[PDB]
Design an enzyme around this catalytic site. Sequence first.
Site, PDB file in Angstrom:
ATOM      1  N   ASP A  96      18.998  67.890  36.055  1.00 30.51           N
ATOM      2  CA  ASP A  96      19.351  67.255  34.903  1.00 30.51           C
ATOM      3  C   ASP A  96      21.024  66.314  36.081  1.00 30.51           C
ATOM      4  O   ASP A  96      21.060  66.153  36.773  1.00 30.51           O
ATOM      5  CB  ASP A  96      19.467  67.675  33.312  1.00 30.51           C
ATOM      6  CG  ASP A  96      18.949  68.386  32.742  1.00 30.51           C
ATOM      7  OD1 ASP A  96      17.876  68.220  32.879  1.00 30.51           O
ATOM      8  OD2 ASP A  96      19.079  69.012  31.723  1.00 30.51           O
ATOM      9  N   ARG A 147      11.510  62.168  35.528  1.00 34.80           N
ATOM     10  CA  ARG A 147      11.905  61.988  34.058  1.00 34.80           C
ATOM     11  C   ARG A 147      12.819  60.494  34.270  1.00 34.80           C
ATOM     12  O   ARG A 147      13.951  60.889  34.773  1.00 34.80           O
ATOM     13  CB  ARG A 147      12.673  62.906  33.685  1.00 34.80           C
ATOM     14  CG  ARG A 147      13.020  62.677  32.066  1.00 34.80           C
ATOM     15  CD  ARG A 147      14.889  63.612  31.996  1.00 34.80           C
ATOM     16  NE  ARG A 147      13.848  65.452  31.088  1.00 34.80           N
ATOM     17  CZ  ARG A 147      14.564  66.382  31.240  1.00 34.80           C
ATOM     18  NH1 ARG A 147      15.961  65.958  31.574  1.00 34.80           N
ATOM     19  NH2 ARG A 147      14.242  67.657  31.213  1.00 34.80           N
TER      20      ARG A 147
HETATM   21  C1  LIG Z   1      14.565  65.345  26.520  1.00 34.29           C
HETATM   22  C2  LIG Z   1      16.099  64.459  27.299  1.00 34.29           C
HETATM   23  C3  LIG Z   1      16.119  64.977  28.297  1.00 34.29           C
HETATM   24  C4  LIG Z   1      17.079  63.603  29.691  1.00 34.29           C
HETATM   25  N1  LIG Z   1      18.253  64.229  30.043  1.00 34.29           N
HETATM   26  C5  LIG Z   1      19.261  63.077  30.741  1.00 34.29           C
HETATM   27  C6  LIG Z   1      20.069  63.535  32.249  1.00 34.29           C
HETATM   28  O1  LIG Z   1      19.451  64.515  32.647  1.00 34.29           O
HETATM   29  N2  LIG Z   1      20.927  63.010  32.537  1.00 34.29           N
HETATM   30  C7  LIG Z   1      21.792  61.637  31.529  1.00 34.29           C
HETATM   31  O2  LIG Z   1      22.399  60.713  31.830  1.00 34.29           O
HETATM   32  N3  LIG Z   1      21.227  61.550  30.056  1.00 34.29           N
HETATM   33  C8  LIG Z   1      19.943  62.444  29.707  1.00 34.29           C
HETATM   34  N4  LIG Z   1      19.430  61.819  28.638  1.00 34.29           N
HETATM   35  C9  LIG Z   1      20.379  60.608  27.501  1.00 34.29           C
HETATM   36  C10 LIG Z   1      19.647  59.523  27.493  1.00 34.29           C
HETATM   37  O3  LIG Z   1      20.496  58.583  29.014  1.00 34.29           O
HETATM   38  C11 LIG Z   1      20.064  58.908  26.409  1.00 34.29           C
HETATM   39  O4  LIG Z   1      21.963  58.928  26.260  1.00 34.29           O
HETATM   40  C12 LIG Z   1      19.678  59.584  25.099  1.00 34.29           C
HETATM   41  O5  LIG Z   1      18.597  59.834  24.807  1.00 34.29           O
HETATM   42  C13 LIG Z   1      19.902  58.079  23.878  1.00 34.29           C
HETATM   43  O6  LIG Z   1      18.952  56.831  24.474  1.00 34.29           O
HETATM   44  P1  LIG Z   1      17.320  56.208  24.190  1.00 34.29           P
HETATM   45  O7  LIG Z   1      16.877  57.234  23.442  1.00 34.29           O
HETATM   46  O8  LIG Z   1      18.213  54.706  23.359  1.00 34.29           O
HETATM   47  O9  LIG Z   1      16.691  56.450  25.093  1.00 34.29           O
HETATM   48  C14 LIG Z   1      18.144  62.795  28.184  1.00 34.29           C
HETATM   49  C15 LIG Z   1      17.196  62.573  26.580  1.00 34.29           C
HETATM   50  C16 LIG Z   1      16.084  63.327  26.695  1.00 34.29           C
HETATM   51  C17 LIG Z   1      15.887  62.894  25.176  1.00 34.29           C
END
Ligand SMILES: Cc1cc2nc3c(=O)[nH]c(=O)nc-3n(C[C@H](O)[C@H](O)[C@H](O)COP(=O)(O)O)c2cc1C
Length: 242
Positions: A96, A147
């Site tokens: 992550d 990812r």
């Molecule tokens: C399954 C999953 C894994 C994630 N891993 C990370 C990460 O490692 N670092 C990070 O900044 N954000 C991570 N996020 C967060 C995204 O940056 C984001 O803030 C969040 O899902 C909302 O944005 P979105 O639905 O509009 O794309 C993750 C989100 C999801 C759903």
Amino acid sequence: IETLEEALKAAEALEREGVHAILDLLGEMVRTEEEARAFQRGLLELVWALAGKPWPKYISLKLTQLGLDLSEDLALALLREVLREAEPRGVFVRLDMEDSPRVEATLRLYRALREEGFSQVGIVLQSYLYRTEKDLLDLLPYRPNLRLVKGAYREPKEVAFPDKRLIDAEYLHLGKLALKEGLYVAFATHDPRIIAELKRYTEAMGIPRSRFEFQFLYGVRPEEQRRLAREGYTVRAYVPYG
Ligand SMILES: Cc1cc2nc3c(=O)[nH]c(=O)nc-3n(C[C@H](O)[C@H](O)[C@H](O)COP(=O)(O)O)c2cc1C
């Protein structure tokens, strides 16, 4: 979900519905090398319990929980020890991506481990940073399993796009760039505009469903998750515990 047992039942329930699980051990915030080693033991327990569970085995971790800032070397050494155990069990480990001062060290660790020969490890890249396209380009020789997220941190306007329109635009750019280069890409987003566009794009480009996936937090848009699995997409839900 608080315990490992509750988390593994949650994975079971997802799997019934054609959705996969990513298990994420959250601990107390690691303040010292001894705490990094205690967190490592919780990870080794997680690997052990996922071992010969019949379905795909995926964990996510934060490197600061292995003492990344205290010492990159030690964080690397402790992560290596985890991957030595995880690799032979078919457990995939995602690193992550935390906040921007930790990006360079995170990519150095990933590169170092790949150069030692570990292969069941991936990275996260965040579309909100200016630096991310170059990081992606720099990483193409490694063939990363990637990812893609937007980004979760408050970052200053000199390192991150301040505009959500630009953040979203960069996400689609980087995603398409990665897919065009042949990388396996996990799209970790809830955004229905971005999901629709990506489904359109992969169809139009003839990118088989086995080359990318969608990732959602546990319980967020659960209907959409089932819908995508029914249409033949690889879908995973992220299950924190601890
Ligand atoms: C399954 C999953 C894994 C994630 N891993 C990370 C990460 O490692 N670092 C990070 O900044 N954000 C991570 N996020 C967060 C995204 O940056 C984001 O803030 C969040 O899902 C909302 O944005 P979105 O639905 O509009 O794309 C993750 C989100 C999801 C759903």
